Design a protein around this ligand. Structure first.
Ligand SMILES: CCOc1cc(N2CCCNCC2)cnc1Br
Ligand SMILES: CCOc1cc(N2CCCNCC2)cnc1Br
Ligand SMILES: CCOc1cc(N2CCCNCC2)cnc1Br
Ligand SMILES: CCOc1cc(N2CCCNCC2)cnc1Br
Ligand SMILES: CCOc1cc(N2CCCNCC2)cnc1Br
Ligand SMILES: *[C@@H]1O[C@H](CO)[C@@H](O)[C@H](O)[C@H]1NC(C)=O
Lengths: 205, 201, 202, 203, 204
């Protein structure tokens, strides 16, 4: 197999509308926000514009191929793949996807999708101008799939919070923490999982 | 049947352009707005920006399947389904759909579509900065289907409302209407959602 | 025939790119603007934002079906139908179509398309804050079809649908049909001019 | 042939991606801007918003049909035709096309496309508020086709006839100049038309 | 072959989704920014709006044809070609592509794609109002392809930095420099190449 064959096979057989659930267990989705910039903060209205990479991983065994004597990974347009229906609950604009919409697929079916996104959020901006800073909480989960179909978890790994954060922003990041939740909305009987990412930041002098 | 089969069958045979009317009785559509946020209020111009979940339910039996030994529900792209042609009459921007455009379909054909929407409205903003607050009325109905084809009916007020909004919700009420426009002989149904809100102190 | 059959037949056989001219006669298009709101008026720049229903009717016999023991009307996506190439000459933004893009088709081929549109216009805003108000003239006609292919006519209570919450009020709406020759081309092109007389309220 | 047949044949056989070059000669494109309005002028930033009809003509013989006992002209969606890849070099927004995207095609293959366009430009706004006015130069040419593939020429005419009487501005004069430019990126010459719009604020 | 045949063949056999890697060697991509205009500078927020031609070249042999007695080049919609997944890392708006989206393809498979783009960036705007000006660094590389699949290099050319820059801008260009980098991100084990274009400019 070469890349052309792999991509052809994926395109011809991939079912972008079918959740790759296996043996009726939930698809385990990992989500991690890598903050790149903070723009347009407004303490009066409690709104903020953020740019972040939304690192998203999951497994879809239907994409798998035998990689002996073949490429181990390819880049695939997300239009040809099933993608988790994640949404930020407190976003007040739709995601502006800044980057090419390609996911990376490994021969065992592991998928990585990591777009850079600019989005405006409603959250707690109070104290952005103090030492202790503001703490903006971003809530992300599957819009339509309950806990038996999609589980959402923060990425297990440690990292430099500001690793990719712009040195030219008027703001700086003090801390990022994550919390997993499972919520029952009065609309539906099942539980829906989400990750809450708490961004602690302040204005630089 | 597995999910793949169900979704394949729906895709291959769904008529997104065909209203699932049965025996010429109207498709009964339920509409309910779950308010998430109020931004950008303007008492001078009587305009307001709102974020809300537009909970929409209806039945389409052409989607039904035998669910013994099969999944009972699936998520389906709305591009593969007929969806009611609802519009907010007093909206002054087109709906900005914030969420993935998927509906939930049950094996008996019951459909739920609940996108989060940001939209600007023309309505009564007067009194927003007072104790009794403003009351903004949002009118939603089928744009082109009369009452014999589509009926619209209303389904805690702040359950999902952002605690970080500059505004707070005092009350939400709903009223069903049936209106005859001078352009057309038939009646058209709508739901009027009255949002009573004020600026927080 | 049920609705599914009718819609299937229309989709399979409709030619959205073909003007439904019959026997060399122009397609008779009716146009009427139902004003819903007036927002963002600017007397300095002579620009105004308007929301209106653009009621558009015409006949396309190719859509017709025998309706005894069948539905008499269906809603059809405009992407499946020929639609008149109308434009507002003095619009300075492209139409923002607010509503689902569906037309109503009757079994004899009569079509109604009535989207709610928000659009900005260049026009005479002077006097908007006076008793007699401003008179904004909106000119609408076929962009590319001359008078032998498309005729345009005004439709044989002005505030009926106008928002009571607008900062403005409508004093009067009048309509005039015109036939104009542009230097770019030898044939005449029809338009309807809708004159909206409005003023700022107390 | 009726219109349905003509439009069907055009749709089925049109190669929107193929430049209708005939016999090693460049496709001759005519361009003319009919100014409708001038909005949002900014003398500090040298930027201006203009609305204009971009009258564009060329010949594509692959579209031709025998018109004896047939319509002589049809309106065709530009998605079904090859269209010149014109761009305004000094535009700072993408064209906002205001009108239905249809071209007029004559039975001999002559094409006319004339959309109304709103676009923002970077140009010389100085003096806009004086008697002699400002002169904004708009440069339009094929983005990717050199002079052996596309030639561009201005269409003696009043490019001002359609200008809004309700604009805050007025047009004093419009002139055109044809250029042939070599860019350091590429060895060939690329043609453009420069339209100079002389205008001022009304007093 | 005429142009119609060439374009037909390209459309029918082109795999826009397949990186034209040849024999386990990265696709060599050249990138060069031709600055056209600088608008909307903000020294408080360190943001700037720039208009530039993003000159991008690479080779795709699957596009090649025998050009004896045939046209040597054609213009091709990029929707029919593989195109490098380049992104500007410090962009804060998506690229507004101003020009027709066509690439130029030579009979040997060389491709040139050069759209004019308007985009807003986060970068160092300080000193823009001084003699020495500001230096805004723009970082461009493949979003998803590591160094064994795509290499990125500045264009070998020497150039006049202001050749196409608008005389009507409120700003002027003092200097443009380029640096190639190879970076390892903590998300992945491989290295990703980028070009950093440093734009030294000031208010007139
Ligand atoms: C039956 C659940 O289907 C749903 C749920 C939701 N929401 C409630 C569950 C959590 N996600 C927010 C919206 C939206 N659309 C459809 Br469709
Ligand atoms: C026959 C009615 O068809 C209609 C009606 C309407 N409206 C009048 C009925 C209620 N909805 C507002 C628009 C718009 N487009 C078409 Br098409
Ligand atoms: C046959 C004329 O073809 C035309 C005419 C116009 N206009 C002149 C005729 C009246 N309508 C305004 C635009 C625009 N595009 C094409 Br294509
Ligand atoms: C054959 C060169 O191909 C080009 C040239 C240019 N430009 C230089 C030639 C004149 N047009 C401006 C852009 C842009 N894209 C491609 Br692709
Ligand atoms: C193999 C890694 O897959 C990736 C990596 C990245 N990035 C990390 C490498 C450098 N480019 C920035 C994003 C984005 N999407 C996918 Br998919
Ligand atoms: C190209 O085709 C021409 C025939 O016109 C011939 O001269 C030559 O052999 C061909 N070149 C290759 C490498 O096939």
């Amino acid at each position: 197999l070469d890349r052309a064959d792999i991509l052809y096979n994926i395109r011809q057989t991939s079912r972008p509308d079918v959740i790759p659930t296996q043996r009726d267990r939930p698809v385990a989705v990992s989500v991690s926000l890598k903050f790149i910039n903070i723009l347009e903060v407004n303490e009066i209205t409690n709104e903020v514009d953020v740019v972040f990479w939304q690192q998203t991983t999951w497994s879809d065994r239907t994409l798998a191929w035998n990689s002996s004597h073949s490429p181990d990974q390819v880049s695939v347009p997300i239009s040809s793949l099933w993608v988790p229906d994640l949404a930020a609950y407190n976003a007040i604009s739709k995601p502006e996807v800044l980057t090419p919409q390609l996911a990376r697929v490994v021969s065992d079916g592991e998928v990585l999708y990591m777009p850079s996104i600019r989005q405006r959020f409603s959250c707690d901006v109070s104290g952005v101008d103090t030492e202790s800073g503001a703490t903006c909480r971003i809530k992300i989960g599957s819009w339509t799939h309950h806990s038996r179909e999609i589980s959402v978890d923060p990425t297990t790994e440690n990292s430099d919070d500001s690793e990719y954060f712009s040195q030219y922003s008027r703001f700086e990041i003090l801390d990022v923490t994550q919390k997993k939740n499972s919520v029952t909305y009065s609309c539906c009987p099942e539980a829906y999982e989400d990750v809450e990412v708490s961004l602690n930041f302040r204005k630089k002098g």
